[PDB]
């Protein structure tokens, strides 16, 4: 969308080419200008679990791709599925510019179509980590799908963003109540890149 394009424009103008940290800071800056830090939580989870195969559902401007890819060990892989071609185009430009393109496989399409292809087509055995940041109504069905397709092993980490605002209540109820998942909640704050709000004025004109 227009916001993601302006984020990319800002990065290209101000971030140091090939420097992933420079790119992240430039985006945090663009969003700042216009509980715990969201980027800090993602970094902490990845550094805690050291995934060699990491699946990202949803990519808007490549912020999350870059943040996660920069921390991966050599030869480790980020696979990113994004349904909107325009967001995927921007994400790849961001990833190229940030210097991490060698770690990222960006795939355009719907998660429910691509997920069952991960083993056969993208040489995945099981996934070490999944970052969920796409359409909220996909969180629980894709989670059940990942399981059904044999992509989860004991120890696989699911990390879901925005589970409160806009919210993924059904996703939360499932994994929390299930003995198949061990759940931890991290309070956070919404950031500019993620959302935007507005008010509507509606003046009644009569029955007419
Ligand atoms: Cl993003
Ligand atoms: Mg988000
Ligand atoms: Na649980």
UniProtKB/Swiss-Prot annotation:
Superkingdom of source: Eukaryota
CC annotations in GO: axon; cytosol; dendrite; extracellular exosome; intracellular membrane-bounded organelle; membrane; plasma membrane; synapse
EC number: 2.1.1.6
Class of enzymatic activity (EC top level): transferase
Binding site for Mg(2+): 133, 161-162
Molecular functions (GO terms): catechol O-methyltransferase activity; magnesium ion binding; methyltransferase activity; O-methyltransferase activity
Chemical reaction(s) catalysed: a catechol + S-adenosyl-L-methionine = a guaiacol + S-adenosyl-L-homocysteine + H(+); 2-hydroxyestrone + S-adenosyl-L-methionine = 2-hydroxy-3-methoxy-estrone + S-adenosyl-L-homocysteine + H(+); 4-hydroxyestrone + S-adenosyl-L-methionine = 4-methoxyestrone + S-adenosyl-L-homocysteine + H(+); 2-hydroxyestrone + S-adenosyl-L-methionine = 2-methoxyestrone + S-adenosyl-L-homocysteine + H(+)
Cofactor remark: Binds 1 Mg(2+) ion per subunit.
Tissue expression summary: Brain, liver, placenta, lymphocytes and erythrocytes.
UniProt binding sites for substrate: 136, 162, 191
Cofactor(s) for this UniProt protein: Mg(2+)
UniProt KW keywords: Catecholamine metabolism, Cell membrane, Cytoplasm, Lipid metabolism, Magnesium, Membrane, Metal-binding, Methyltransferase, Neurotransmitter degradation, Phosphoprotein, S-adenosyl-L-methionine, Schizophrenia, Signal-anchor, Transferase, Transmembrane, Transmembrane helix
Membership in a protein family: Belongs to the class I-like SAM-binding methyltransferase superfamily. Cation-dependent O-methyltransferase family.
Function of the molecule: Catalyzes the O-methylation, and thereby the inactivation, of catecholamine neurotransmitters and catechol hormones. Also shortens the biological half-lives of certain neuroactive drugs, like L-DOPA, alpha-methyl DOPA and isoproterenol.
Protein's name in the database: Catechol O-methyltransferase
Organism: Homo sapiens
Name of the gene this protein is made from: COMT
Shown segment, full-protein numbering: 53 to 266 of 271
């Amino acid at each position: 969308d227009t916001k993601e394009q302006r984020i990319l424009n800002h990065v290209l103008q101000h971030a140091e080419p090939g420097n992933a940290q420079s790119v992240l800071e430039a985006i945090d800056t663009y969003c700042e200008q216009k509980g715990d830090k969201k980027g800090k939580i993602v970094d902490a989870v990845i550094q805690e679990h050291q995934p060699s195969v990491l699946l990202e559902l949803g990519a808007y401007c490549g912020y999350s791709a870059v943040r996660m890819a920069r921390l991966l060990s050599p030869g480790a892989r980020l696979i990113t599925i994004e349904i909107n071609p325009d967001c995927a185009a921007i994400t790849q430009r961001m990833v190229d510019f940030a210097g991490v393109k060698d770690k990222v496989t960006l795939v355009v399409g719907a998660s429910q179509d691509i997920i069952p292809q991960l083993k056969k087509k993208y040489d995945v055995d099981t996934l070490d980590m999944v970052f969920l940041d796409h359409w909220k109504d996909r969180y629980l069905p894709d989670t059940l799908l990942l399981e059904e397709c044999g992509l989860l092993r004991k120890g696989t980490v699911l990390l879901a963003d925005n589970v409160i605002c806009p919210g993924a209540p059904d996703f939360l109820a499932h994994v929390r109540g299930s003995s198949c998942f061990e759940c931890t909640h991290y309070q956070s704050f919404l950031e500019y890149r993620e959302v935007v709000d507005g008010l509507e004025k509606a003046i009644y004109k009569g029955p007419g």
